[PDB]
Homo-oligomer: A and B are copies of this chain.
Amino acid sequence: KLLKDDFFASDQQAVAVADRYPQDVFAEHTHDFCELVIVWRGNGLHVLNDRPYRITRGDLFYIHADDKHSYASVNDLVLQNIIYCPERLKLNLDWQGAIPGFNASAGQPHWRLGSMGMAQARQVIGQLEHESSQHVPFANEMAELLFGQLVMLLNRHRYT
């Protein structure tokens, strides 16, 4: 079980970006935080709650804290985890309405994004990566606004 104390920059940081360039084989685990997974390139086997997914560029996964998942049989798998703590979000967006897997396992954890969706996600995530400093005034609020933009754009662009 991965702990937010080990993955977030402080107790008040609500969102962070964990780059996996590449994602190597990773053991079955749960979390005490949630995460969005976006696959940028390569492929691999994502096993989510005992269900195997052959994942590839354009795949989007919504993961809840209590989901157990792993990565195996990877091939230059390039992804990003956008990790977040629901209880730390302050903005009044309807997070639960826009994020499958916000309060429990997603009904549908797996989605896809087209070129436009990936372009917008790339742009927002790049800015979000830059807002990680816990010393720059209100960087955490700026990061939450960008996470909000990412969440809306994913809802706008995603498909089954």
Interface range on chain A (Cβ under 8 Å from partner): 10 to 19
B156 engages A149 (CB within 8 Å):
no
Most chain B beta carbons < 10 A, residue from A91, A145, A153: A145
Docked Cα-Cα span, A149 to B137, in Å, equals 12
How many Å from the CB of A12 to the closest CB on chain B? 15
Contact of A152 among B90, B141, B149, B156 (CB under 8 A): B141
How many Å from the CB of A109 to the closest CB on chain B? 21
| Identical subunits present | 2
A145 engages B149 (CB within 8 Å):
yes
Which residues of A72-110 are within 8 A (CB) of B? 90-93
The residue on B at minimum CB distance from A90 is B92
The residue on B at minimum CB distance from A138 is B152
Contact of A156 among B91, B93, B136 (CB under 8 A): B136
Docked Cα-Cα span, A136 to B91, in Å, equals 22
Which residues of A94-153 are within 8 A (CB) of B? 136-138, 141-142, 145-146, 148-149, 152-153
